[PDB]
Design a protein around this motif. Sequence first.
Motif, short mmCIF file in Angstrom:
data_model
loop_
_atom_site.label_atom_id
_atom_site.label_comp_id
_atom_site.label_asym_id
_atom_site.label_seq_id
_atom_site.Cartn_x
_atom_site.Cartn_y
_atom_site.Cartn_z
N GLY A 1 3.27 -39.54 -14.00
CA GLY A 1 3.88 -38.45 -13.25
C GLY A 1 5.22 -38.83 -12.67
N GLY A 2 5.42 -40.13 -12.47
CA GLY A 2 6.58 -40.64 -11.74
C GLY A 2 7.61 -41.23 -12.69
N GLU A 3 7.27 -41.22 -13.97
CA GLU A 3 8.13 -41.74 -15.01
C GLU A 3 9.34 -40.83 -15.21
OE1 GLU A 3 7.04 -44.71 -16.16
OE2 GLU A 3 8.96 -44.86 -17.22
N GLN A 4 10.53 -41.42 -15.27
CA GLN A 4 11.75 -40.65 -15.46
C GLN A 4 11.96 -40.37 -16.93
OE1 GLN A 4 15.09 -41.25 -12.12
NE2 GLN A 4 14.82 -43.05 -13.44
N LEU A 5 12.14 -39.10 -17.27
CA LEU A 5 12.26 -38.68 -18.67
C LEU A 5 13.37 -37.63 -18.85
CD1 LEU A 5 8.42 -38.17 -19.39
CD2 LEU A 5 9.79 -40.14 -20.09
N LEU A 6 13.96 -37.53 -20.06
CA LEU A 6 14.88 -36.42 -20.33
C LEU A 6 14.08 -35.12 -20.45
CD1 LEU A 6 17.47 -37.57 -23.04
CD2 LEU A 6 16.58 -38.98 -21.20
N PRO A 7 14.57 -34.04 -19.82
CA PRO A 7 13.87 -32.79 -19.74
C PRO A 7 14.24 -31.70 -20.76
CG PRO A 7 15.53 -32.99 -18.03
CD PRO A 7 15.81 -34.00 -19.04
N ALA A 8 15.28 -31.92 -21.57
CA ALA A 8 15.84 -30.83 -22.39
C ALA A 8 16.00 -29.54 -21.55
CB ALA A 8 14.98 -30.60 -23.64
N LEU B 1 20.88 -35.32 -12.13
CA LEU B 1 21.46 -34.07 -12.56
C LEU B 1 22.81 -34.31 -13.23
CD1 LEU B 1 20.70 -31.54 -9.71
CD2 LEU B 1 19.70 -31.76 -11.92
N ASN B 2 22.95 -33.91 -14.50
CA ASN B 2 24.20 -34.06 -15.22
C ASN B 2 24.66 -32.75 -15.79
OD1 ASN B 2 26.19 -36.23 -15.72
ND2 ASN B 2 25.93 -35.68 -17.87
N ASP B 3 23.80 -31.74 -15.75
CA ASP B 3 24.18 -30.38 -16.11
C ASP B 3 23.10 -29.39 -15.72
OD1 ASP B 3 22.28 -30.10 -18.14
OD2 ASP B 3 23.70 -30.20 -19.83
N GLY B 4 23.40 -28.10 -15.88
CA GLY B 4 22.46 -27.06 -15.50
C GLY B 4 21.47 -26.72 -16.61
N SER B 5 21.93 -26.86 -17.87
CA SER B 5 21.20 -26.38 -19.04
C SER B 5 20.14 -27.34 -19.54
CB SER B 5 22.16 -26.04 -20.19
OG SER B 5 22.70 -27.21 -20.77
N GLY B 6 20.40 -28.63 -19.40
CA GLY B 6 19.56 -29.64 -20.01
C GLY B 6 20.10 -30.12 -21.34
N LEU B 7 21.18 -29.54 -21.83
CA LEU B 7 21.72 -30.01 -23.08
C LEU B 7 22.02 -31.50 -22.97
CD1 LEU B 7 24.80 -29.14 -25.18
CD2 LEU B 7 22.50 -29.84 -25.87
N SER B 8 22.46 -31.94 -21.79
CA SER B 8 22.91 -33.31 -21.60
C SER B 8 21.78 -34.35 -21.63
CB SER B 8 23.70 -33.46 -20.29
OG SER B 8 23.99 -34.84 -20.02
N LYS C 1 8.26 -22.89 -19.32
CA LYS C 1 9.57 -23.06 -19.93
C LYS C 1 9.47 -24.18 -20.93
CE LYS C 1 14.08 -22.56 -20.69
NZ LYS C 1 13.79 -23.16 -22.02
N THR C 2 10.19 -24.03 -22.04
CA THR C 2 10.19 -24.97 -23.12
C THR C 2 11.42 -25.87 -23.08
OG1 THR C 2 11.19 -23.28 -24.56
CG2 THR C 2 8.80 -23.60 -24.67
N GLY C 3 11.44 -26.87 -23.96
CA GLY C 3 12.49 -27.85 -23.90
C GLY C 3 12.40 -28.65 -25.15
N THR C 4 13.43 -28.63 -25.98
CA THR C 4 13.40 -29.40 -27.22
C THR C 4 14.79 -29.88 -27.66
OG1 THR C 4 11.40 -28.10 -27.97
CG2 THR C 4 12.46 -29.52 -29.60
N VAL D 1 6.09 -33.46 -20.32
CA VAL D 1 7.37 -33.92 -20.84
C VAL D 1 7.17 -35.12 -21.77
CG1 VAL D 1 9.74 -34.50 -20.28
CG2 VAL D 1 8.36 -33.17 -18.63
N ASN D 2 7.60 -34.95 -23.02
CA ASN D 2 7.41 -35.97 -24.04
C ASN D 2 8.76 -36.50 -24.41
OD1 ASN D 2 4.48 -34.93 -24.50
ND2 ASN D 2 5.76 -33.19 -25.12
N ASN D 3 8.86 -37.82 -24.48
CA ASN D 3 10.07 -38.51 -24.81
C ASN D 3 9.73 -39.60 -25.83
OD1 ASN D 3 12.51 -38.77 -22.10
ND2 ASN D 3 11.43 -36.93 -22.85
N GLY D 4 10.52 -39.69 -26.90
CA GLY D 4 10.45 -40.85 -27.78
C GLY D 4 9.57 -40.74 -29.02
N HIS D 5 8.84 -39.64 -29.15
CA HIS D 5 8.19 -39.30 -30.41
C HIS D 5 9.22 -39.37 -31.53
CE1 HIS D 5 9.44 -35.46 -28.47
NE2 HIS D 5 9.88 -35.16 -29.67
#
Length: 466
Positions: free
Chosen positions: A41-48, A343-350, A410-413, A436-440
């Motif tokens: 739960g506390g792991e930092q991940l990219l959110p898309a 936070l590096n952007d609003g959209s998650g593209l980053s 909400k989705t994120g890919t 949130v899945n990262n690294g697959h």
Amino acid sequence: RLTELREDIDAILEDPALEGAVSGVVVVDTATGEELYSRDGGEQLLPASNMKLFTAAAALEVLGADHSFGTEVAAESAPGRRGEVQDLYLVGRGDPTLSAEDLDAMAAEVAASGVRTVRGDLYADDTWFDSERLVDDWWPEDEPYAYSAQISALTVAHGERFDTGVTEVSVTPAAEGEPADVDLGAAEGYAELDNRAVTGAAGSANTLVIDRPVGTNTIAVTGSLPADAAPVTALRTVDEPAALAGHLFEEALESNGVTVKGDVGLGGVPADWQDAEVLADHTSAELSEILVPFMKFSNNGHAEMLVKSIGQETAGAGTWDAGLVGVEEALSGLGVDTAGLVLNDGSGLSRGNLVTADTVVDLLGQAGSAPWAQTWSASLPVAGESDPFVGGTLANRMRGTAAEGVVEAKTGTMSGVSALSGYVPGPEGELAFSIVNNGHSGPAPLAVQDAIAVRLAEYAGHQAPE
Ligand SMILES: *[B-](O)(O)CNC(=O)c1ccccc1[N+](=O)[O-]
Ligand SMILES: [Mg+2]
Ligand SMILES: [Mg+2]
């Protein structure tokens, strides 16, 4: 019953498709605060695109559900007996839903207010935000596609989805061996055309590529379109959205009987203008209403513009630096612990963004008791709902399951990142979850997320509609 659920989720995450991935999974009953399930739960991940959850919550906090955005046309003084002005200014204050029709309706106003001739030049003023068009770390190779459109305070949004700062390109086959017809849409006479595409023999292979080469305003069209192929349409971004909005305005003006004798270009209302004559205006619909296409379809333009709009509200600075601090401040104001958030952007593209699954659930909790809760959930995709403005990016997932019609998330890919977070309401309690899945390495683990969502729907006492 609690443990059964836990064992099921454990097994669902046993999936092979999650080999070498880190997976943040957190589920919380929201009536009680009970932590039903927690893993990394506390792991930092990219959110898309789950980053929008944050953005959208801040915008509601800062701008308000009732906020709207305006656009005006301005001359230095009202037009004469002779109906003449010098230079004319189209000024956008960040409406993410300005249509070509609105430009038309504003050109009619300018005509109704007695202008018959712009003697000088027409300027498109997007100075309400800065001119930093793309986020630092966004990938140059992505710049042709709608989700990577440049950011401006004056942007024309295309269609009912309001995709900003793009144009529709359509390519029609001709007779075999003749060049394909390329139609550039709104950007006709703005963006340049490099048409190398050809019509292939009937039934031959479709190899048509539409691109905008990095650092140009050229649509480069290559390959072969089958003589019998359906016409192809594609949304492609343009350089300098405001200048295209300017371009379109000149055409709306000429169309509404107003002759522009000068050039079209970028420019801000001069400082030395005493008391500008507002000759037309448009007001957008309210933020509550705008959240729908933004959140249902994961509009990246809308997200960044909201950020810059927050920067404007909190600091009169239509800026990423200013807006992101704005978002983080708002979220704190909400009760959210923003420790894990980067936070590096609003959209998650980053790819510079970081969340944790705990933070997401945290936000989901706070947003639930905020006064704007309803307009907030209304914006989220509803699982398996086939009406696009209801189902959004979840329209074709989880149909015929307990989650259908119930789960709002909400989705994120992107490469090696997928996310699903939102609510499961029910005969039990209103559940907030984040996955949130990262690294697959293969495809996004959508089946894996579905399984969890569905089991939570079943745990909250739902059943698959037959
Ligand atoms: B979000 O939509 O989950 C983050 N994803 C994107 O911004 C996105 C959307 C649609 C196409 C591509 C893309 N990319 O990030 O490449
Ligand atoms: Mg044109
Ligand atoms: Mg149900």
